[PDB]
Write a protein that binds this ligand. Structure first.
Ligand SMILES: O=c1ccn([C@@H]2O[C@H](COP(=O)(O)OP(=O)(O)O)[C@@H](O)[C@H]2O)c(=O)[nH]1
Ligand SMILES: O=c1ccn([C@@H]2O[C@H](COP(=O)(O)OP(=O)(O)O)[C@@H](O)[C@H]2O)c(=O)[nH]1
Ligand SMILES: O=c1ccn([C@@H]2O[C@H](COP(=O)(O)OP(=O)(O)O)[C@@H](O)[C@H]2O)c(=O)[nH]1
Lengths: 192, 192, 193
């Protein structure tokens, strides 16, 4: 772990991050995964709540070449671990074992379209549920109950930074998933 | 107002920016709203025309953590990150309960999938018209006639920076709307 | 006439100049690799030796992104303007649309196809001979390359994202029979919508 401007970044490779995520699936508790970049670290400077959340996440992966370039001053970061690429690699691995995934986030139809694209890419992928990221506080509890009841183990949150990390942290004791990871615009790129 | 590398940035919070926009609706003249970030501020360095436009806009909101981090050097730094996408949604949220909105910009059907989405999110929202942002100089005057005749008060321009600010500025005396704001890729994220 | 911005060579060209360069590339019977470096790309090249080697071997590196253009202000001869990759791609197509077989490779399912339908409506006369998504397998790779070659494509726009797009073009540089091969990032997604 190297603390880049208050935000702790885990000194892991793409392979190492993927292995950490699989190991997290063996523990029956929620693990918060975040992919900090230059924008995220800058957001943490002004936002004390956001920085507190980052300092409490299970894995902070070095998304973005900015952080990796800055780390060259320090034992620097081994490689750029992209959040989109990590999500796809982690999903690729876990489709063969049938781990229940839930997609929460983005505009209407984006999550169902990404689910369709991921099924075509990774045959045997178990995406147990989807919901858009434009829900209200009243709708929030019904989405949480849906995830919990559907038996979801991996939850990908595409609400954008800091919204995704803040949502996961606020509901950390309400969610019964093994991994909860902020993915941002990831659902938009795969759905098109 | 902070002078970040020649570009004036308004020292406002999310709430303050929304209230400013609501008050702009009470003045019978066009108000140009821009959401500068590090990419925009850097564009202004080499583009004198663009920097002149940004020094002539009614409200420059600090979108992007870069500007907000840079402001930490000043005696009076910026209070928070006021994201352009988040501002556009919060403003629409308030005025939905019947201010006439027009969506101009993005590829074919994006502005229309955006409109349909905003109508589902904010019931009662009056989006009086939409047009794609890939129009010709001939088509330009028919769009401007459409906005003016349809009685639009708020105009969201999704042409990208600096294209959106330059389009608004060039047509500042041809448009009969109270607010004209550059929203870049806000239309694609809400449409999905 | 080239600026070494942190190991990555950037061509000191304007929007017009870049377009003319591309039009002249069409007169040479060999593949030309076009890349649009920005601060993210430039930074990716620092840790990725393979990627920096590719960027030092491309035919045209256009100044996409204000960061590079701002950094260049330090040099005796700075960069004249930003040459945005999306804007370059559209201006180039605009021209060649009246005359040139284009192939769109990249992005999610139906994105390249919707980008083709939109470019056909924007630039009437545009000859887009084929499209394919960018989530293909190594087995599917050769059928796409055969499709591009057999359909007689001259211009190939690769929307795979940096560094994936430049690495794909470079790895297949001697397998592709096109005159121009350019990394266009998320350009297909903005035009398709
Ligand atoms: O209340 C919101 C606001 C946005 N979004 C989604 O969040 C993503 C924002 O992507 P962005 O690139 O801005 O985030 P980043 O990669 O910086 O974290 C998009 O898919 C939006 O549709 C959402 O689901 N809920
Ligand atoms: O001639 C143009 C060029 C662009 N756009 C739209 O403007 C946005 C381009 O912005 P981008 O995603 O590149 O990011 P930004 O520069 O705003 O940060 C997209 O909605 C495009 O479809 C448009 O309507 N007309
Ligand atoms: O293996 C992959 C991964 C991504 N993409 C596409 O590559 C683009 C990535 O866009 P991005 O904005 O991340 O790239 P940049 O502008 O930084 O080069 C999107 O259209 C994705 O759908 C693809 O075709 N193949």
């Amino acid at each position: 772990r190297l603390d880049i401007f208050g935000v702790p970044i885990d000194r892991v490779t793409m392979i190492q991050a993927v292995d950490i995520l699989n190991n997290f699936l063996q523990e029956n508790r929620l693990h918060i995964v975040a992919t900090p970049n230059a924008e995220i670290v800058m957001m943490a400077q002004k936002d004390k709540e956001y920085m507190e959340i980052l300092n409490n996440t299970d894995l902070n992966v070095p998304d973005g070449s900015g952080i990796v370039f800055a780390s060259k001053v320090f034992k620097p970061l081994p490689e750029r671990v992209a959040g989109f690429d990590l999500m796809l690699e982690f999903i690729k691995g876990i489709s063969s074992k049938g781990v229940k995934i839930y997609l929460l986030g983005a505009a209407c139809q984006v999550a169902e379209q990404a689910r369709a694209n991921l099924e075509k890419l990774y045959p045997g992928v178990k995406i147990v549920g989807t919901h858009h990221g434009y829900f209200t506080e009243e709708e929030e509890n019904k989405i949480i109950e849906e995830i919990n009841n559907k038996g979801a183990e991996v939850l990908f949150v595409a609400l954008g930074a800091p919204k995704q990390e803040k949502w996961i942290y606020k509901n950390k004791d309400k969610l019964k998933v093994k991994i909860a990871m902020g993915v941002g615009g990831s659902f938009d790129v795969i759905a098109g």
